[PDB]
Amino acid sequence: MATLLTTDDLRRALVESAGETDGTDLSGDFLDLRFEDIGYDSLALMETAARLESRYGVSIPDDVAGRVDTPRELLDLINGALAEAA
């Protein structure tokens, strides 16, 4: 019932966590890229998660958001969460 995060939607989340997101070419297959390269702190990934929590109604522990190596993992986390959420 909840909209499973797509590529564009996940990209939206990764933008919201910083506000502006220049330099970081994110719109062009970003699932297996590394946060290190896109200048993303795992602390900021908790922001990414939080954005989606408050939006979708999911529950993402901050310990988890900072544990994701690739956005693929972040995506699957919330896709799984959504599948057992709504």
Coordinates of N, CA and C in Angstrom, one line a residue:
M1 N 0.8 -1.2 0.0 CA 0.0 0.0 0.0 C 0.9 1.2 0.0
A2 N 2.0 1.2 0.7 CA 3.0 2.3 0.7 C 3.8 2.1 -0.6
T3 N 4.2 3.2 -1.2 CA 5.0 3.2 -2.4 C 6.5 2.8 -2.1
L4 N 6.8 1.6 -2.6 CA 8.2 1.1 -2.5 C 9.1 2.1 -3.2
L5 N 10.2 2.4 -2.5 CA 11.2 3.4 -3.0 C 11.8 3.0 -4.3
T6 N 11.6 3.8 -5.3 CA 12.2 3.7 -6.5 C 13.6 4.3 -6.6
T7 N 14.2 4.4 -7.7 CA 15.5 5.0 -7.9 C 15.3 6.5 -7.7
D8 N 14.4 7.1 -8.4 CA 14.1 8.6 -8.2 C 13.7 8.9 -6.9
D9 N 12.9 8.1 -6.2 CA 12.4 8.4 -4.9 C 13.5 8.4 -3.9
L10 N 14.4 7.3 -4.0 CA 15.5 7.2 -3.1 C 16.5 8.3 -3.3
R11 N 16.6 8.8 -4.5 CA 17.5 9.9 -4.9 C 16.9 11.2 -4.2
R12 N 15.6 11.3 -4.1 CA 15.0 12.4 -3.4 C 15.4 12.5 -2.0
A13 N 15.4 11.3 -1.4 CA 15.8 11.2 0.0 C 17.2 11.6 0.3
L14 N 18.1 11.2 -0.6 CA 19.6 11.5 -0.6 C 19.8 13.0 -0.8
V15 N 18.8 13.7 -1.4 CA 18.9 15.1 -1.6 C 18.5 15.8 -0.4
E16 N 17.3 15.4 0.1 CA 16.7 16.0 1.3 C 17.6 16.0 2.6
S17 N 18.5 14.9 2.7 CA 19.4 14.8 3.8 C 20.5 15.9 3.8
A18 N 20.7 16.5 2.7 CA 21.7 17.6 2.6 C 21.1 18.9 2.3
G19 N 20.0 18.9 1.5 CA 19.3 20.1 1.1 C 19.7 20.3 -0.3
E20 N 20.9 20.8 -0.5 CA 21.4 21.0 -1.9 C 22.3 19.8 -2.0
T21 N 22.5 19.3 -3.2 CA 23.3 18.2 -3.5 C 24.0 18.3 -4.8
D22 N 25.0 19.2 -4.9 CA 25.7 19.5 -6.1 C 27.0 18.7 -6.1
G23 N 27.6 18.5 -7.2 CA 28.8 17.7 -7.3 C 28.6 16.2 -7.3
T24 N 27.7 15.8 -6.4 CA 27.3 14.5 -6.3 C 26.3 14.1 -7.4
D25 N 26.8 13.5 -8.5 CA 26.0 13.0 -9.5 C 25.2 11.8 -9.0
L26 N 24.0 12.0 -8.7 CA 23.3 11.0 -8.0 C 22.2 10.5 -8.9
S27 N 21.8 11.2 -9.9 CA 20.8 10.8 -10.8 C 21.4 10.1 -12.0
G28 N 21.8 8.8 -11.8 CA 22.5 8.1 -12.8 C 23.0 6.7 -12.3
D29 N 22.1 5.9 -11.7 CA 22.5 4.6 -11.2 C 23.4 4.7 -10.0
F30 N 22.8 4.9 -8.8 CA 23.6 5.2 -7.6 C 23.4 4.2 -6.5
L31 N 23.1 3.0 -6.9 CA 22.8 2.0 -5.9 C 24.0 1.3 -5.3
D32 N 25.0 1.2 -6.1 CA 26.3 0.6 -5.6 C 27.4 1.5 -5.5
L33 N 27.2 2.8 -5.6 CA 28.2 3.7 -5.3 C 28.5 3.9 -3.8
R34 N 29.6 4.4 -3.5 CA 29.9 4.5 -2.1 C 29.7 5.9 -1.5
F35 N 29.2 6.0 -0.3 CA 28.8 7.2 0.3 C 30.1 8.1 0.5
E36 N 31.2 7.5 0.7 CA 32.5 8.1 0.8 C 32.7 9.1 -0.4
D37 N 32.4 8.5 -1.5 CA 32.7 9.2 -2.8 C 31.7 10.4 -3.0
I38 N 30.5 10.2 -2.6 CA 29.5 11.2 -2.7 C 29.5 12.2 -1.6
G39 N 30.5 12.1 -0.8 CA 30.7 13.0 0.4 C 29.5 12.8 1.3
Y40 N 29.1 11.6 1.6 CA 28.1 11.4 2.5 C 28.5 10.7 3.8
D41 N 28.2 11.4 4.9 CA 28.4 10.8 6.2 C 27.3 9.9 6.6
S42 N 27.6 8.9 7.3 CA 26.6 8.0 7.7 C 25.6 8.6 8.7
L43 N 26.1 9.6 9.4 CA 25.3 10.5 10.3 C 24.3 11.2 9.4
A44 N 24.6 11.6 8.2 CA 23.7 12.2 7.3 C 22.8 11.2 6.7
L45 N 23.2 10.0 6.7 CA 22.3 8.9 6.2 C 21.1 8.7 7.2
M46 N 21.4 9.0 8.4 CA 20.3 9.0 9.4 C 19.3 10.0 9.1
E47 N 19.7 11.1 8.5 CA 18.8 12.2 8.1 C 18.0 11.7 6.9
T48 N 18.7 11.0 6.0 CA 18.1 10.4 4.8 C 16.9 9.4 5.3
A49 N 17.3 8.6 6.2 CA 16.4 7.6 6.8 C 15.2 8.4 7.5
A50 N 15.5 9.4 8.3 CA 14.5 10.1 9.1 C 13.5 10.8 8.1
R51 N 14.0 11.3 7.0 CA 13.1 11.9 6.0 C 12.1 11.0 5.5
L52 N 12.5 9.8 5.2 CA 11.7 8.7 4.8 C 10.8 8.1 5.9
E53 N 11.3 8.1 7.1 CA 10.5 7.7 8.3 C 9.3 8.5 8.4
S54 N 9.5 9.8 8.6 CA 8.5 10.8 8.8 C 7.5 10.9 7.6
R55 N 8.0 10.5 6.4 CA 7.3 10.5 5.2 C 6.4 9.3 5.0
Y56 N 7.1 8.1 5.1 CA 6.4 6.8 4.8 C 5.8 6.2 6.1
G57 N 6.2 6.6 7.2 CA 5.7 6.0 8.4 C 6.4 4.8 8.9
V58 N 7.7 4.7 8.6 CA 8.5 3.6 8.9 C 9.4 3.9 10.1
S59 N 10.1 2.9 10.6 CA 10.9 3.0 11.7 C 12.3 2.5 11.4
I60 N 13.2 3.5 11.3 CA 14.6 3.1 10.9 C 15.6 3.6 12.0
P61 N 16.2 2.7 12.8 CA 17.1 3.0 13.8 C 18.4 3.7 13.2
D62 N 18.9 4.7 13.8 CA 20.0 5.5 13.4 C 21.3 4.6 13.3
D63 N 21.4 3.6 14.1 CA 22.5 2.6 14.1 C 22.6 1.9 12.7
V64 N 21.4 1.7 12.2 CA 21.3 1.0 10.9 C 21.6 1.9 9.8
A65 N 21.1 3.1 9.8 CA 21.3 4.1 8.7 C 22.8 4.4 8.5
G66 N 23.5 4.3 9.6 CA 25.0 4.6 9.5 C 25.8 3.3 9.2
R67 N 25.1 2.2 9.1 CA 25.7 0.9 8.8 C 25.7 0.6 7.4
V68 N 24.8 1.2 6.6 CA 24.7 0.9 5.2 C 25.9 1.3 4.3
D69 N 26.5 0.3 3.6 CA 27.7 0.6 2.8 C 27.3 1.2 1.5
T70 N 26.3 0.8 0.9 CA 25.8 1.3 -0.4 C 24.3 1.7 -0.3
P71 N 23.8 2.6 -1.1 CA 22.4 3.0 -1.2 C 21.5 1.8 -1.5
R72 N 22.1 0.8 -2.1 CA 21.4 -0.5 -2.4 C 20.8 -1.1 -1.1
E73 N 21.6 -1.1 -0.1 CA 21.3 -1.6 1.2 C 20.2 -0.7 1.9
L74 N 20.4 0.6 1.7 CA 19.5 1.6 2.3 C 18.1 1.4 1.6
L75 N 18.1 1.2 0.3 CA 16.9 1.0 -0.5 C 16.2 -0.3 0.0
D76 N 16.9 -1.4 0.0 CA 16.3 -2.7 0.4 C 15.7 -2.7 1.8
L77 N 16.4 -2.0 2.6 CA 16.0 -1.8 4.0 C 14.6 -1.3 4.1
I78 N 14.4 -0.2 3.4 CA 13.1 0.5 3.4 C 12.1 -0.2 2.6
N79 N 12.5 -0.8 1.5 CA 11.6 -1.6 0.7 C 11.0 -2.8 1.5
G80 N 11.9 -3.4 2.2 CA 11.5 -4.5 3.1 C 10.6 -3.9 4.2
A81 N 11.0 -2.8 4.8 CA 10.2 -2.2 5.8 C 8.8 -1.8 5.4
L82 N 8.7 -1.3 4.2 CA 7.4 -0.9 3.6 C 6.5 -2.1 3.3
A83 N 7.1 -3.2 2.9 CA 6.4 -4.4 2.6 C 5.8 -5.0 3.9
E84 N 6.3 -4.7 5.0 CA 5.7 -5.2 6.3 C 5.1 -4.0 7.0
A85 N 5.0 -2.9 6.4 CA 4.4 -1.7 7.0 C 3.0 -1.4 6.5
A86 N 2.9 -1.3 5.2 CA 1.6 -0.9 4.6 C 1.5 -1.5 3.2

